């Protein structure tokens, strides 16, 4: 599913991400935009051989099991395929774990390079939320 901007804002709010660990909703919508362009099905292979999955591009070296990243931790205890669903609950729940792991949202390198320090509030402009 390719979400629309306000539809994704509304689903992420509903799953408790607005202000989760201090990060307002515009941060999470900006991260999904540049990580996956709002597409739940996005996968990207990494040079260490891991693959990043879904809307928030959660990586298989640490967070999910895809059966082909040797010696990866599966900290969200989820097959990586679960993160490509049209329903974002698995992605939001694993993201909540990731953002609590000591480095906040700097774990999403498109957030750090394209959203961090910008007016993220523009990402939820106009949405009935
Ligand atoms: C090609 C490219 O850039 N791809 C990225 C892809 O790599 C992105 O996925 C991210 O990858 C990085 C690197 O593997 C992940 O960062 C590491 O995450 C672990 C777990 O949190 C960090 O370990 C933790 O570190 C803190 C202190 O630093 C400790 O207190 C914790 O206890 C410790 N946890 C454990 C279990 O040890 C580690 O330090 C990070 N390493 C670095 C170099 O930052 C990152 O989590 C991962 N992000 C996601 C969302 O999965 C992906 C997303 O940006 O997109 C691009 O594909």
Swiss-Prot record:
<dbReference type="GO" id="GO:0005737">
    <property type="term" value="C:cytoplasm"/>
</dbReference>
<dbReference type="GO" id="GO:0042802">
    <property type="term" value="F:identical protein binding"/>
</dbReference>
<dbReference type="GO" id="GO:0005783">
    <property type="term" value="C:endoplasmic reticulum"/>
</dbReference>
<feature type="binding site">
    <location>
        <position position="101"/>
    </location>
    <ligand>
        <name>substrate</name>
    </ligand>
</feature>
<protein>
    <recommendedName>
        <fullName>Lysozyme C</fullName>
        <ecNumber>3.2.1.17</ecNumber>
    </recommendedName>
</protein>
<dbReference type="InterPro" id="IPR000974">
    <property type="entry name" value="Glyco_hydro_22_lys"/>
</dbReference>
<dbReference type="InterPro" id="IPR019799">
    <property type="entry name" value="Glyco_hydro_22_CS"/>
</dbReference>
<dbReference type="GO" id="GO:0005615">
    <property type="term" value="C:extracellular space"/>
</dbReference>
<comment type="subunit">
    <text>Monomer.</text>
</comment>
<keyword id="KW-0732">Signal</keyword>
<dbReference type="InterPro" id="IPR001916">
    <property type="entry name" value="Glyco_hydro_22"/>
</dbReference>
<comment type="similarity">
    <text>Belongs to the glycosyl hydrolase 22 family.</text>
</comment>
<dbReference type="GO" id="GO:0016231">
    <property type="term" value="F:beta-N-acetylglucosaminidase activity"/>
</dbReference>
<dbReference type="Pfam" id="PF00062">
    <property type="entry name" value="Lys"/>
</dbReference>
<feature type="active site">
    <location>
        <position position="52"/>
    </location>
</feature>
<feature type="active site">
    <location>
        <position position="35"/>
    </location>
</feature>
<dbReference type="GO" id="GO:0050829">
    <property type="term" value="P:defense response to Gram-negative bacterium"/>
</dbReference>
<keyword id="KW-0081">Bacteriolytic enzyme</keyword>
<dbReference type="GO" id="GO:0050830">
    <property type="term" value="P:defense response to Gram-positive bacterium"/>
</dbReference>
<comment type="function">
    <text>Lysozymes have primarily a bacteriolytic function; those in tissues and body fluids are associated with the monocyte-macrophage system and enhance the activity of immunoagents. Has bacteriolytic activity against M.luteus.</text>
</comment>
<feature type="disulfide bond">
    <location>
        <begin position="64"/>
        <end position="80"/>
    </location>
</feature>
<keyword id="KW-0378">Hydrolase</keyword>
<feature type="domain" description="C-type lysozyme">
    <location>
        <begin position="1"/>
        <end position="129"/>
    </location>
</feature>
<feature type="disulfide bond">
    <location>
        <begin position="30"/>
        <end position="115"/>
    </location>
</feature>
<dbReference type="GO" id="GO:0031640">
    <property type="term" value="P:killing of cells of another organism"/>
</dbReference>
<keyword id="KW-1015">Disulfide bond</keyword>
<dbReference type="GO" id="GO:0042742">
    <property type="term" value="P:defense response to bacterium"/>
</dbReference>
<feature type="disulfide bond">
    <location>
        <begin position="76"/>
        <end position="94"/>
    </location>
</feature>
<feature type="disulfide bond">
    <location>
        <begin position="6"/>
        <end position="127"/>
    </location>
</feature>
<keyword id="KW-0929">Antimicrobial</keyword>
<dbReference type="GO" id="GO:0003796">
    <property type="term" value="F:lysozyme activity"/>
</dbReference>
<keyword id="KW-0326">Glycosidase</keyword>
<dbReference type="InterPro" id="IPR023346">
    <property type="entry name" value="Lysozyme-like_dom_sf"/>
</dbReference>
<dbReference type="GO" id="GO:0016998">
    <property type="term" value="P:cell wall macromolecule catabolic process"/>
</dbReference>
<keyword id="KW-0964">Secreted</keyword>
<keyword id="KW-0020">Allergen</keyword>
């Amino acid at each position: 599913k390719v979400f629309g901007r306000c539809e994704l804002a509304a689903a992420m709010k509903r799953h408790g991400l607005d202000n989760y660990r201090g990060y307002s909703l515009g941060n999470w919508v900006c991260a999904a935009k540049f990580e996956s362009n709002f597409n739940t099905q996005a996968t990207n292979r990494n040079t260490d051989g891991s693959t990043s999955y879904g809307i928030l591009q959660i990586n298989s070296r640490w967070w999910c099991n895809d059966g082909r990243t040797p010696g990866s931790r599966n900290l969200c205890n989820i097959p990586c395929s679960a993160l490509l669903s049209s329903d974002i609950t698995a992605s939001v729940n694993c993201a909540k774990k990731i953002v609590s792991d000591g480095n906040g949202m700097n774990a999403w390198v498109a957030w750090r390079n394209r959203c961090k320090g910008t007016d993220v509030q523009a990402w939820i402009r106009g949405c009935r939320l």
